[PDB]
Design an enzyme around this catalytic site. Structure first.
Site, mmCIF file in Angstrom:
data_model
loop_
_atom_site.group_PDB
_atom_site.id
_atom_site.type_symbol
_atom_site.label_atom_id
_atom_site.label_comp_id
_atom_site.label_asym_id
_atom_site.label_seq_id
_atom_site.Cartn_x
_atom_site.Cartn_y
_atom_site.Cartn_z
ATOM 1 N N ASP A 1 0.830 -1.221 0.000
ATOM 2 C CA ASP A 1 0.000 0.000 0.000
ATOM 3 C C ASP A 1 0.847 1.246 0.000
ATOM 4 O O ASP A 1 1.349 1.716 1.009
ATOM 5 C CB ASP A 1 -0.907 -0.040 1.216
ATOM 6 C CG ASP A 1 -1.963 1.039 1.185
ATOM 7 O OD1 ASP A 1 -1.858 1.910 0.273
ATOM 8 O OD2 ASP A 1 -2.850 1.020 2.073
ATOM 9 N N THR A 2 0.974 1.842 -1.189
ATOM 10 C CA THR A 2 1.735 3.079 -1.319
ATOM 11 C C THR A 2 1.067 4.272 -0.609
ATOM 12 O O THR A 2 1.757 5.261 -0.339
ATOM 13 C CB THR A 2 1.949 3.440 -2.786
ATOM 14 O OG1 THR A 2 0.663 3.614 -3.440
ATOM 15 C CG2 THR A 2 2.719 2.337 -3.487
ATOM 16 N N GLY A 3 -0.229 4.167 -0.309
ATOM 17 C CA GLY A 3 -0.958 5.208 0.393
ATOM 18 C C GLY A 3 -0.831 5.162 1.891
ATOM 19 O O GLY A 3 -1.364 6.064 2.579
HETATM 20 C C1 LIG Z 1 -6.567 6.792 3.422
HETATM 21 C C2 LIG Z 1 -5.076 6.660 3.094
HETATM 22 C C3 LIG Z 1 -4.409 8.043 3.121
HETATM 23 C C4 LIG Z 1 -4.374 5.841 4.202
HETATM 24 N N1 LIG Z 1 -4.715 4.484 4.395
HETATM 25 C C5 LIG Z 1 -4.196 3.507 3.459
HETATM 26 C C6 LIG Z 1 -5.205 3.254 2.303
HETATM 27 O O1 LIG Z 1 -4.415 2.649 1.264
HETATM 28 C C7 LIG Z 1 -6.351 2.330 2.700
HETATM 29 C C8 LIG Z 1 -5.951 0.870 2.985
HETATM 30 C C9 LIG Z 1 -7.120 0.002 3.362
HETATM 31 C C10 LIG Z 1 -7.714 -0.900 2.498
HETATM 32 C C11 LIG Z 1 -8.877 -1.584 2.851
HETATM 33 C C12 LIG Z 1 -9.414 -1.424 4.123
HETATM 34 C C13 LIG Z 1 -8.829 -0.587 5.077
HETATM 35 C C14 LIG Z 1 -7.707 0.111 4.640
HETATM 36 N N2 LIG Z 1 -7.344 2.309 1.634
HETATM 37 C C15 LIG Z 1 -8.531 2.914 1.646
HETATM 38 O O2 LIG Z 1 -8.937 3.652 2.512
HETATM 39 O O3 LIG Z 1 -9.209 2.632 0.470
HETATM 40 C C16 LIG Z 1 -10.470 3.281 0.332
HETATM 41 C C17 LIG Z 1 -10.190 4.687 -0.219
HETATM 42 C C18 LIG Z 1 -10.662 4.645 -1.671
HETATM 43 O O4 LIG Z 1 -10.686 3.256 -1.984
HETATM 44 C C19 LIG Z 1 -11.153 2.566 -0.818
HETATM 45 S S1 LIG Z 1 -5.106 3.949 5.898
HETATM 46 O O5 LIG Z 1 -5.471 2.507 5.802
HETATM 47 O O6 LIG Z 1 -6.119 4.825 6.487
HETATM 48 C C20 LIG Z 1 -3.629 3.873 6.859
HETATM 49 C C21 LIG Z 1 -3.110 5.023 7.415
HETATM 50 C C22 LIG Z 1 -1.916 5.046 8.099
HETATM 51 C C23 LIG Z 1 -1.058 3.928 8.061
HETATM 52 N N3 LIG Z 1 0.052 3.953 8.801
HETATM 53 C C24 LIG Z 1 -1.561 2.754 7.480
HETATM 54 C C25 LIG Z 1 -2.820 2.732 6.847
#
Ligand SMILES: CC(C)CN(C[C@@H](O)[C@H](Cc1ccccc1)NC(=O)O[C@H]1CCOC1)S(=O)(=O)c1ccc(N)cc1
Lengths: 99, 99
Positions: A25-27
Site C-alpha cells: 500500500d503506497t498510500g
Molecule cells: C486513506 C489513506 C491516506 C491511508 N490508508 C491507506 C489506504 O491505502 C487504505 C488501505 C485500506 C484498504 C482496505 C481497508 C482498510 C484500509 N485504503 C482505503 O482507505 O481505500 C479506500 C479509499 C478509496 O478506496 C477505498 S489507511 O489505511 O487509512 C492507513 C493510514 C496510516 C497507516 N500507517 C496505514 C494505513
C-alpha cells in the site's frame, strides 16, 4: 516482480513466525497488521483514514519477510480490517511505482 | 516516471480545469476526492477504510488528468483525509508496482 493493479496487490509475508497475506500500500505511511503478539516493548498510537481513527500498538525493530525480501522497521498492531505493508517497509524492499 | 516511496507519492491532478494534489494509493480500490462539484448524476457507494465504512457520492465517466496522464472513470466524492487516486485509475494510466 511487476504487479499490475487490476486486483488488490496482495502478497505473502512472514512476521512473528506466522505466514500472512498483506496489501502492498503506497498510500499507507506505516505498516499495520491485525492483532497478534510481538516481542518487546510497545507504545500506543492512533492512526486514521477513511472512517476515522483506530488505536494500535507500535512495535519497533520488527523483522518482516515480504514476498521473499527481508526488511526491518516499525510495525503497528491493531484492529485493521486488512494487513497493510506501508511505505516504511516498501522502501526497504526497493518497491517503486512506475507509469 | 519511477516513483520511490521515501516520501508520500503525491502528484498533481486536474479535474474540472482545476489543479489539485492527490496521493497515488495502491491500497485504495477506488478514487476519492474531497468535496467539490462534478457534473451529472451520482449514485450511492459505501467505501471501507481503516476506521470502517462510510457513505460517498459516486460519479461515473469523469475526465481527470493524473500527472499528465489522461483517465476517464469513476470518481467518488466524500470525507477523505486527502485526495486519493486508486486502482481504478492507476490501471488506466498504466501504473505498476515493481520490486
Ligand atoms: C486513506 C489513506 C491516506 C491511508 N490508508 C491507506 C489506504 O491505502 C487504505 C488501505 C485500506 C484498504 C482496505 C481497508 C482498510 C484500509 N485504503 C482505503 O482507505 O481505500 C479506500 C479509499 C478509496 O478506496 C477505498 S489507511 O489505511 O487509512 C492507513 C493510514 C496510516 C497507516 N500507517 C496505514 C494505513
Amino acid at each position: 516482480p511487476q504487479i499490475t493493479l487490476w486486483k488488490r496487490p496482495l502478497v505473502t509475508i512472514k512476521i512473528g513466525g506466522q505466514l500472512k497475506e498483506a496489501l502492498l500500500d503506497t498510500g499507507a505511511d506505516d505498516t499495520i497488521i491485525e492483532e497478534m503478539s510481538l516481542p518487546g516493548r510497545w507504545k500506543p498510537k492512533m492512526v486514521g483514514g477513511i472512517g476515522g481513527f483506530i488505536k494500535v500498538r507500535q512495535y519497533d525493530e520488527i523483522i518482516i519477510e515480504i514476498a521473499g525480501h527481508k526488511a526491518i522497521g516499525t510495525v503497528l498492531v491493531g484492529p485493521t480490517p486488512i494487513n497493510i505493508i506501508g511505505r516504511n517497509l516498501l522502501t526497504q524492499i526497493g518497491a517503486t511505482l512506475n507509469f
